[PDB]
């Protein structure tokens with residue numbers, strides 16, 4: 001593996017048909033027999049690992065202990081028609097058969113899988129690199145074909161990305177994707193987060209901040225994968241282990257708890273449909289259920305208690321599952337604003353930014369970057385701004401001890417961490433906790449869950465308060481959430497048009513009060529009339545209440561103007577009221593809703609069209625890649641896959657800096673400097689080597 | 695074929711075969727596709743309408759019960775909101791089909807201690823149910839056309 | 841897919857599809873690794889014929 | 890119509906240079922090319 005790593009280092013910054021690449025190909029040809037021997041050593045054991053798991057092999061497996069004889073192995077393995085005589089003999093020799101010629105094939109298959117994995121992967125990387133940089137050497141396809149099984153086995157783990165390299169050229173990078181990273185990426189919640197992020201950027205984002213947003217999303221997703229890892233499942237100690245198990249159980253099943261709460265609310269309301277009010281006990285009145293079964297009354301009480309419990313558990317699961325991500329994101333943005341902007345060193349927001357004003361409470365706290373990974377942010381800010389703004393002033397602002405920095409660099413102290421609750425008491429950072437609780441209580445999802453819990457509690461004071469939890473169907477169902485977004489899209493326009501309707505109805509009220517008062521008698525009686533327009537407030541209420549809801553306007557309700565000195569004036573009054581209020585303004589409301597529908601639909605279509613017509617990374621359209629068949633699909637799955645950039649970021653984070661290669665160090669330094677010039681913009685490997693490849 | 699067979703049991707079952715005009719005529723098939731395109735959205739908005747009408751039913755049952763006497767007689771009243779099921783049926787049946795909402799059907803709240811509460815009740819019912827949700831249904835159809 | 845299992849071993853599986861040698865091809869392709877007799881039982885073939 | 894007018898104006902301003910008319914795609918070959926072109930090279934405020 002070390003030798004192959006040296007070879008790969010020789011291939012750094014190597015152009016297509018490069019001298020070093022062709023020299024390496026010639027060297028491999030010079031040792032063709034040995035390279036074939038190595039590739040054969042790998043492929044026989046790779047094939048054995050899957051053969052021993054085959055039903056055809058298990059048919060020959062007959063010993064109850066789980067073993068197989070050498071002769072049985074011989075007749076089973078040549079039945080697969082995959083190895084030759086010498087290869088089967090070699091496998092028999094390598095098998096540690098006992099004096100009874102019994103073979104433990106379970107351990108035999110797994111003996112060399114782990115030891116050979118690293119060298120196998122590096123051989124796959126080397127052959128892939130040579131094949132993609134010397135594409136017209138007939139001697140190399142023989143090695144590629146002999147290494148077909150190795151390449152196929154390592155295909156899911158061989159990640160490749162393209163960067164703008166150290167030499168002002170597009171370079172292709174090969175690295176290793178781990179099984180855990182790929183599996184965590186393929187989780188449905190992470191896929192949904194990816195879809196949401198893609199929609200946000202492609203819809204309401206620009207080209208300038210796109211790569212910044214993508215990297216921020218990658219970091220957030222890495223933190224989410226860590227959260228999933230911790231919450232995943234395979235006297236103080238016992239209570240602690242049970243507590244963390246219970247909290248992880250709540251976190252894993254948060255959405256099932258939400259669905260259960262919804263179902264419980266539905267059941268409670270279905271029972272509530274049977275309520276009946278009677279003056280007789282089951283001058284005030286009694287409310288009671290009216291059913292013959294007799295179990296609905298206890299069932300309602302049980303369901304109410306269970307619904308309250310489920311709501312409380314949902315609150316707990318949320319604060320164990322999403323609150324860490326909220327805090328992580330806020331801490332990260334605050335740290336970057338401190339370092340790269342000096343938000344509280346240079347600009348000092350002008351009291352109109354409630355978020356920035358609230359973040360001041362956390363600056364000097366001992367545990368400010370609790371979730372954000374960078375614990376040295378205060379050090380970096382000090383080193384960056386202390387010379388110009390004062391080391392002591394910066395230290396006071398960030399709550400640092402200047403004397404302790406030296407000793408922390410000096411050595412490490414190992415104190416006694418006593419596992420006592422009394423000692424745990426003052427170990428709490430009260431100011432940081434206040435800041436965190438403010439951040440949480442300003443969060444929309446937490447606020448919704450808290451309102452849900454509060455309404456559940458009020459449901460015990462009065463069971464009809466459980467009707468409010470039926471509104472949870474709006475966010476529980478994505479389709480209903482979209483339909484309601486189709487109303488909330490133009491909410492300000494709807495409010496403004498309602499206010500305009502109020503104003504125009506007020507003008508009509510003024511006219512009616514001044515001139516058409518005799519027509520607002522809504523009393524069939526002759527001696528006590530009920531005049532609706534003898535007061536401005538009463539007339540305005542009458543208009544806004546009956547005229548707007550009337551199909552033909554106010555003229556439907558007020559008296560007939562036939563045979564009056566004001567007949568024409570009043571018919572103009574009624575007709576204009578009908579046209580402006582009933583027709584035009586209500587039609588405006590419907591049109592605002594309908595245009596919101598159309599706008600949302602075309603947003604979805606535009607996002608899909610952009611994703612299917614342009615590369616998310618380089619921006620080159622699908623038309624260029626379609627010159628070669630399936631070119632865009634291969635470009636987005638192998639060349640510029642964004643999942644591969646995310647995996648590369650995780651790979652850099654996990655890998656040791658002293659083990660970083662030249663390209664990896666380049667990208668890592670650019671990442672830490674927050675410079676996104678390594679992302680290919682408007683150029684790709686195929687474009688750069690058009691003449692050579694074609 | 696089954697409906698044709700049932701038509702011999704009762705000739706009025708032959709009316710069902712008139713629906714064959716939907717697939718026999720391409721234009722009508724397209725017009726009906728203009729409805730079936732957003733069928734899930736229409737079902738969801740109908741369910742939402744049911745939920746909001748249920749909330750209004752709950753409010754009416756708890757507070758505005760005296761206004762649901764639909765009997766002109768003086769000694770035997772027909773109270774429509776003395777049971778939750780009856781009140782919910784009354785709302786979903788008459789309030790949705792009424793042009794001005796439930797306030798068109800229920801009694802006049804003039805000169806009552808709950809006048810303003812009831813006018814807010816009626817106006818919000820008219821705006822949310824009669825205007826907004828029905829407009830959403832029409833818009834789903836029209837967007838399917840487009 | 842669960843319903844298509846009933847037709848695999850039937851003598852007249854490709855009645856309308858033109859390829860009458862599909863069972864032969866599937867056997868030649870997968871019998872070595874998964875068992876000629878098992879594939880023949882799955883597809884209802886007589887290896888002797 | 891009013892909504893699509895606003896969208897069309899925004900799209901034209903974000904996709905073409907107001908002065909030379911060359912589209913953002915040409916300037917995007919160099920990263921941030923259109924932004925730098927409209928802030929330094931062909932800024933209309935600079936012509937004013």
Ligand SMILES: Nc1ncnc2c1ncn2[C@@H]1O[C@H](COP(=O)(O)OP(=O)(O)OP(=O)(O)O)[C@@H](O)[C@H]1O
Pocket residue numbers: 611612614615616617618636637640641642643
């Ligand atoms: N740079 C890019 N990286 C990844 N995908 C890209 C890129 N540029 C464009 N795309 C598009 O992103 C889309 C992502 O695929 P999508 O998430 O819809 O998969 P899918 O159809 O659900 O697949 P599966 O069946 O495997 O679940 C692809 O259709 C691809 O064309």
Ligand SMILES: Nc1ncnc2c1ncn2[C@@H]1O[C@H](COP(=O)(O)OP(=O)(O)OP(=O)(O)O)[C@@H](O)[C@H]1O
Pocket residue numbers: 902903905906907908909927928931932933934
């Ligand atoms: N020749 C040009 N000169 C100036 N702007 C141009 C030109 N061609 C296109 N534009 C576009 O004009 C837009 C003008 O920016 P705009 O007035 O929207 O700024 P803004 O987002 O409100 O900025 P700020 O945050 O600084 O107030 C830019 O987005 C730019 O892409």
Ligand SMILES: O=c1[nH]cnc2n[nH]cc12
Pocket residue numbers: 218219222373653
């Ligand atoms: O997203 C990240 N970027 C850099 N370093 C990190 N450590 N842990 C997570 C990290």
Ligand SMILES: [Ca+2]
Pocket residue numbers: 657658659660
């Ligand atoms: Ca090194």
Ligand SMILES: [Zn+2]
Pocket residue numbers: 615616617618619620635640684
């Ligand atoms: Zn690309």
Ligand SMILES: [Zn+2]
Pocket residue numbers: 906907908909910911926931
């Ligand atoms: Zn220009």
